[PDB]
Assembly symmetry: D2
Homo-oligomer: 381 residues x 4
Amino acid sequence: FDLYRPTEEHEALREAIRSVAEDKIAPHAADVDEQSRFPQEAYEALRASDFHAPHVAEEYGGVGADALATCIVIEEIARVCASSSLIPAVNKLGSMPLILSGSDEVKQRYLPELASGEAMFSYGLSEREAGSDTASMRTRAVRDGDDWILNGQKSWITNAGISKYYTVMAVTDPDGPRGRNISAFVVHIDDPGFSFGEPERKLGIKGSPTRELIFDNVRIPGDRLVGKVGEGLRTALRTLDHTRVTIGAQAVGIAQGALDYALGYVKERKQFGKAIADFQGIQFMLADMAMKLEAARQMVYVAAAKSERDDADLSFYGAAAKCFASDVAMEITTDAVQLLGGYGYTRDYPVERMMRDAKITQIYEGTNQIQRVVMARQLLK
Amino acid sequence: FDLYRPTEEHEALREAIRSVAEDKIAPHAADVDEQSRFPQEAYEALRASDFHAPHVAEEYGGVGADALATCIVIEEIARVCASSSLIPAVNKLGSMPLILSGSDEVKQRYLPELASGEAMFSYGLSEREAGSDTASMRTRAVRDGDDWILNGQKSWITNAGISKYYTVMAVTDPDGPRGRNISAFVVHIDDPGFSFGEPERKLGIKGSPTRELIFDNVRIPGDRLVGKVGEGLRTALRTLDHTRVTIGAQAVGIAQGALDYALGYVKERKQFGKAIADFQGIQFMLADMAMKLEAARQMVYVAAAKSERDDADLSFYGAAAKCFASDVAMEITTDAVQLLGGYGYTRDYPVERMMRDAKITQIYEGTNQIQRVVMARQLLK
Amino acid sequence: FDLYRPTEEHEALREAIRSVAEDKIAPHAADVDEQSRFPQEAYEALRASDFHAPHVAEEYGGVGADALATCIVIEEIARVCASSSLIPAVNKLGSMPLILSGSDEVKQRYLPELASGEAMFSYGLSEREAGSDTASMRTRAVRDGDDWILNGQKSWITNAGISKYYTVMAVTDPDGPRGRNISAFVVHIDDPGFSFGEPERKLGIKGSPTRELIFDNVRIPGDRLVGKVGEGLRTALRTLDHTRVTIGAQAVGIAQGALDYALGYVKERKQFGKAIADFQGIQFMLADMAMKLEAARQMVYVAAAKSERDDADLSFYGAAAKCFASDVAMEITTDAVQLLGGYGYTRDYPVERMMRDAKITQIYEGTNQIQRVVMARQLLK
Amino acid sequence: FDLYRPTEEHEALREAIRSVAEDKIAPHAADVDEQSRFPQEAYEALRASDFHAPHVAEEYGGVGADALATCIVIEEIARVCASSSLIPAVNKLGSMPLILSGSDEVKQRYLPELASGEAMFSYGLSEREAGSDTASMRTRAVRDGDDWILNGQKSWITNAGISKYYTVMAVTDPDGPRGRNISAFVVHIDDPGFSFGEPERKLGIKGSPTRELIFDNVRIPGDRLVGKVGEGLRTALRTLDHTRVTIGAQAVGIAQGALDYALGYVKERKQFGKAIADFQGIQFMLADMAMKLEAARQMVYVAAAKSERDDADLSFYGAAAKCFASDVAMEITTDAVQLLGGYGYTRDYPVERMMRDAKITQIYEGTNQIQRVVMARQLLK
Ligand SMILES: Cc1cc2nc3c(=O)[nH]c(=O)nc-3n(C[C@H](O)[C@H](O)[C@H](O)COP(=O)(O)OP(=O)(O)OC[C@H]3O[C@@H](n4cnc5c(N)ncnc54)[C@H](O)[C@@H]3O)c2cc1C
Ligand SMILES: Cc1cc2nc3c(=O)[nH]c(=O)nc-3n(C[C@H](O)[C@H](O)[C@H](O)COP(=O)(O)OP(=O)(O)OC[C@H]3O[C@@H](n4cnc5c(N)ncnc54)[C@H](O)[C@@H]3O)c2cc1C
Ligand SMILES: Cc1cc2nc3c(=O)[nH]c(=O)nc-3n(C[C@H](O)[C@H](O)[C@H](O)COP(=O)(O)OP(=O)(O)OC[C@H]3O[C@@H](n4cnc5c(N)ncnc54)[C@H](O)[C@@H]3O)c2cc1C
Ligand SMILES: Cc1cc2nc3c(=O)[nH]c(=O)nc-3n(C[C@H](O)[C@H](O)[C@H](O)COP(=O)(O)OP(=O)(O)OC[C@H]3O[C@@H](n4cnc5c(N)ncnc54)[C@H](O)[C@@H]3O)c2cc1C
Ligand SMILES: CC(=O)SCCNC(=O)CCNC(=O)[C@H](O)C(C)(C)COP(=O)(O)OP(=O)(O)OC[C@H]1O[C@@H](n2cnc3c(N)ncnc32)[C@H](O)[C@@H]1OP(=O)(O)O
Ligand SMILES: CC(=O)SCCNC(=O)CCNC(=O)[C@H](O)C(C)(C)COP(=O)(O)OP(=O)(O)OC[C@H]1O[C@@H](n2cnc3c(N)ncnc32)[C@H](O)[C@@H]1OP(=O)(O)O
Ligand SMILES: CC(=O)SCCNC(=O)CCNC(=O)[C@H](O)C(C)(C)COP(=O)(O)OP(=O)(O)OC[C@H]1O[C@@H](n2cnc3c(N)ncnc32)[C@H](O)[C@@H]1OP(=O)(O)O
Ligand SMILES: CC(=O)SCCNC(=O)CCNC(=O)[C@H](O)C(C)(C)COP(=O)(O)OP(=O)(O)OC[C@H]1O[C@@H](n2cnc3c(N)ncnc32)[C@H](O)[C@@H]1OP(=O)(O)O
């Protein structure tokens, strides 16, 4: 009766990534956060064992991992270092427009490099004046001969400056129909006229660089185009249906690492002659954490399986899984800090970082408010 | 990729029970509640299509439906009439101690009658002074020759007076070790010295009779014994691991029928020139309802599959699924009443009954407080 | 230091109404609910001790109680019978348009009768197609000589059929400016062409009659007019600024009676060898109930004092106090049912009625959704 | 009708502290947090206008401000800089054992210095192995001639290293009765054998130093004793009844500054052609923030007035106000971050610091869990 559980191969993949995460990634998490620096140790351990971008097809030298497997990887990394979890998460986000809409030549040019881990990918959608409202973006791409000239800026780009390649969405016709006048392009770190802004000072995922892309007449070849002229936003949003699920998986992981730490702590700590775990009010809190986490985890796995089959209701299930899991992670991390008392408020324990990191999950890949707008559209048609 | 969904056979069973529920059961739900009377129409339609006790093995003339199938049946009935959903739910609860612990002869005597629907089952555990604290029960069974003599009372028995057979737990040794001095017996409606109390006046599931069993020197044969002397509480609690999941499935159904009604209503109703559904604050409420329901539904299906395999962690997952789904159903029904305004507060719409019925799901088969005690034990060992 | 408490005279008024409520009103509450019948015993005890309409000015034979005193009365009644609390609450709601906008002659005609308790008042604003959207009402009043002719219907009128007088809002010019084409009139129970609909079957406040007013060419004298032609909605909404606070006071009372009962119960009931109150998870629940109730109570008193002074920010504080206190009452009553276990789900204990009654407080005098619309307008200008 | 509001003198004090806070304190808040350094600018502006310790009696050169006035000061500072708010809050916490239990000579020695602002006070209760469980503390004070010798350690001391004087609680008889074998002493920064630990690295209130006190045979005169031998814990806990209210006032302030910023932001920011404030889902969020804040604020003022009169139920009201206001501040700050989107997650806006600072309010002066233990004791006796 193999209903409603991961396969044996998924559970073996879980032990393998857990093992890389606990030995190679976890030891460096406090320092990655404290110095706001890229988790280089984690990148190298993920690259050595093929967990840095597992979703890439075997045809390109990839692992060809399914959508649920990929979620388990991101979850198990996020359990110990949220910044590190963004290596596979943003590698998927940036590459997915190619995998969904790109020509065989574009795929063949870029995906092998991701597969071997010589290159990381970023995704450039958001701007200063168009975050949630992606259709109002102002970055322009103009034909010049067979070339494209890009002008404008993207905001908030994860792994910017480290990533070699940048999937960038830009207006290809300012008079074309709203939502359908935008195209996707691969931009290289060394393209002319392309700079980065100063790194953001953030609440959490501090080791993940977050920076503006600035495009000053960036000339790029015509073969940088991903899919069809004007179909770029369509591709960028179809991407978010799949990747929202991985941010759900991240939130679950962050929540799980916080619960693991709090549980271990309250079994050991004694006040009034008893373990903190022996107080029923604490038991009730722990039960609530565990029950909500498990509900979020299963809902993520249901959405991941939907992502793998491309089920017609993926839009609702990806928004619900991401929203739910991020809300739950926010509550659980806040409670994990609480359960350690004074100690939980200090950087000597990891729970305060986990609380800081959880808060991003409610904002990126579409604010939980936008998630609710998307869920309501699906219920009402 | 058949991960994290019901089988095609489960979806065909869903359309069949939905069809019986909408045509034969739903039309009578308001009257079942209003007159506090047994849903006889529903019993007859469930019996005619083999949904009154689907879990019984084919060996006994049953459907031999798996634990998830059984949950979908209870869910789809509970969508339209919570009182009716208790026909399969309490049939399982009452029969499960036989299925788990009874001899071939006991099973062969009672299960065929349930399978054909000539008999309903009830379960007698709780007492006046021992609800949550089952191990402190005072109903006694004393050997007399080969017979047993039962003395005491059970409280709160669902389908009492309608059920022909009663799985009753009683102390078989007042000096034996706590938790392990209790046995299970099948009691017939016509056994000597056995009466019922006056029906409870309840908030909801009003058509489901709820009554005390009174045992005044009830003489019954030695072959009424279910499993082993002293192992009765062990069996009764193992039962609740499986059946807690069906109360989760019930809560989901109640919540789903309330959301279906509220959605339909807010698309039609206009204030300030627009459909109520067009107000973003209402959209956010509806999204929250739908997202929480879906998280509860999936968590129930994960627990049901665990019930079918008898996974070692069933105890945690059944308590979490039941607790979560009942909490969520309470919130959603309260919000469904709200979304209809004045109309939602009247018995002309079904949402107020659905709110009243949802509240029981937080109390029976173990209060949500006891669910949290059980979940905390499992996390801490 | 007389800051942030009621006066000694308010505390003496509290003991007097508590005393009338516990002896004369409470004994009949279960029967008032069970038979859906008017609380006649309560009306007579409130009339005998001047608590049926205490807000009326001494100039009219009234008690001239301030807005906070009036809230304490409604609170202390609502502690034992929510239906009874609506005698002073709807007496205020119906009379307030006269007190605020009526001529000396209108006041002199109607308020003395309320003061002595020969007459109850109702308020007719809502319609079938205009609840929340009051400005879209369709009840019309047309001049004919010096008379007015009323045509249409009002929905959901509390104490209808018992009340002698009806403050009714109607369109006095279908071409006039939206919001400012409506007038208020006093309608007598015996006016020609005036009938009532069949009583609503409700979830709670079942002893309070709730019925449609039907106006079939109701001819009434020109001196029935309350304030100025077209200024009627302005008066009706100014009323709701004051009266929303009394529904806050009601919710507090309902919540307080539920907490009183649950506390008393969990001190007495024993499971597992201890009082239910000795379990820390229950302690935490009780603390949460008590803390939220007290926050709602104080916020109501702050709004009541604002109502008495007519502070400029009353609109925000009345909506916030009503919304908060009703949300809190809904949660507390739901938890009070839970704390009694099985017993809490039966009509032999009063907590289930208190839960049913609490739910109305989230809907009338402006849905909590409308309360949030009003609060957001005030924050944003 | 002067019910349920601050006096005119309280509102004039509010404008004066608001004015000092916005001009002299607010400009430095981001840098105080970013460099984890003491808010020296704020100390000097508070000292110049007599807001650094306003509660001290005029008899000692103080302002003699009442308990509500003192709460408004802490609230208005906390609106712009939570670290700065702890100057008056910890000055009160440290001095209160003297004000409540100290001799005229002890008061005359220490309070004038606080009043003029030449000295700050700290309070040393908590230890490594006794936080919540204060009665189990192990710091010892032993008589030697007329002197006392202190040995042990205190944990988590706010303003340690800056404060000149330290009210320290220590065991004065290890064989005496639990709870009643402890005394309070004033310790000077230059007493022999007294050192500080390395400053804690914290989530928030980073400019407030938090450090261990280490006592290595600290010899101090007999006249350092505050009140009576063995009555020290009694005094320390009576203190917390008053000071818990100021942490409520702090939380309110933090919440208010976060709401002020979010409101201002959502009126200006446009997506999809409209101000973010024009989206009803955002309106509902803002209403909820404002309504909960106001309920917390009033409940704090009610508790402050109780603190000023020393009402018999202060214990319940101080725990409820502190718990409620800190829970509400945690939710509101989390929502304020959310309402700014990406910007809210960066240190260029103050909302993320406000979220980090709010979390401490749930932990110090007694964890919200301990607050619930205290509230349940008061309800149940
Ligand atoms: C750490 C970090 C990393 C990021 N990485 C990337 C990346 O790699 N690639 C990329 O393209 N982007 C990235 N982003 C951008 C991120 O997804 C955007 O911030 C997000 O889409 C919100 O946009 P915004 O900040 O402009 O907020 P806005 O759109 O200005 O929204 C502000 C507030 O308004 C609310 N709101 C907006 N519209 C509505 C509506 N219609 N109804 C109700 N409420 C509404 C929002 O929920 C929010 O609370 C990143 C952001 C962060 C913080
Ligand atoms: C409609 C209905 C149908 C029922 N049908 C059946 C049936 O068919 N068969 C059957 O055997 N029983 C049946 N019951 C009984 C039901 O399961 C019991 O009410 C339930 O086990 C709770 O028992 P109680 O009412 O005695 O509450 P108590 O055990 O008295 O509990 C009272 C309160 O204390 C709390 N509490 C108790 N122990 C703890 C603890 N250790 N820690 C924290 N909080 C605690 C509970 O959660 C509850 O809130 C039914 C009940 C109802 C209402
Ligand atoms: C027991 C009872 C007694 C009553 N007594 C009286 C009385 O004495 N006098 C009287 O005049 N009326 C009375 N009423 C009417 C009551 O105040 C109305 O039901 C209320 O104003 C809501 O109107 P409605 O039922 O038409 O709901 P609708 O206005 O149809 O609202 C339906 C749903 O839409 C939501 N909604 C509506 N507008 C918005 C919006 N703009 N933004 C977001 N959500 C929105 C509402 O909150 C609600 O959830 C009574 C009602 C009841 C149930
Ligand atoms: C920034 C900061 C500043 C501080 N400043 C001062 C200061 O100036 N002076 C001072 O004396 N102290 C100070 N403290 C100490 C602070 O008040 C303590 O941390 C607090 O009393 C909790 O103690 P703890 O950390 O040892 O947690 P513990 O007591 O170990 O508690 C751990 C967890 O167990 C829970 N818990 C404990 N007992 C129970 C129970 N009986 N029932 C249920 N749950 C329980 C707690 O709520 C918490 O969630 C400060 C702390 C911080 C973080
Ligand atoms: C991970 C980060 O940090 S980066 C990404 C962060 N940003 C986001 O997640 C953006 C959040 N916003 C969005 O998802 C969208 O802008 C929304 C949901 C707000 C909708 O905005 P709208 O202006 O209403 O867009 P609309 O729904 O018209 O979509 C525009 C076009 O894309 C298409 N589209 C939208 N969603 C999808 C989808 N899931 N799959 C395929 N196409 C889609 C539309 O159908 C439309 O094309 P069409 O006109 O030919 O049908
Ligand atoms: C559906 C209704 O309306 S009817 C049922 C309603 N009532 C309930 O759900 C009862 C709620 N209460 C319970 O579940 C239990 O009484 C609990 C969880 C509170 C535990 O009570 P305790 O006194 O702590 O019982 P304890 O855990 O010692 O269990 C007693 C015995 O049953 C066994 N047992 C308990 N749970 C299980 C289980 N899930 N599977 C098998 N055996 C079990 C124990 O191991 C023990 O036997 P042992 O001593 O040989 O190990
Ligand atoms: C107790 C029950 O069961 S009965 C009452 C139940 N019904 C309600 O509570 C109704 C709920 N709805 C309302 O409060 C209103 O209809 C609202 C808040 C939704 C606003 O509706 P809108 O169409 O937006 O009305 P608007 O705000 O323009 O008000 C109409 C007029 O009344 C005035 N008005 C509104 N509120 C007030 C007030 N508090 N005081 C004085 N005048 C007011 C307006 O200023 C306007 O007159 P103007 O154009 O001369 O300024
Ligand atoms: C601000 C910070 O960061 S510093 C302060 C941080 N720490 C705290 O707030 C500590 C939290 N803990 C406490 O409040 C207490 O230790 C509690 C509530 C957990 C109670 O602990 P217990 O061991 O149960 O203490 P108990 O209630 O017996 O109190 C000990 C003694 O103090 C007395 N006492 C307790 N509360 C008070 C009070 N509010 N007023 C006066 N005396 C009091 C008791 O009556 C008792 O003396 P007694 O035996 O003569 O009656």
